[PDB]
Structures are given as structure tokens and as C-alpha cells.
Design brief:
little secondary structure, 13 residues, elongated
Amino acid sequence: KWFRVYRGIYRRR
């Protein structure tokens, strides 16, 4: 996983 996600990019913290 990556760092804390945010509004604008689909990911998982």
C-alpha cells in the first residue's frame, strides 16, 4: 500500500 490516500486519486492507504 501507499501513504494516506486523497480525493482525486484511487488508492489504498
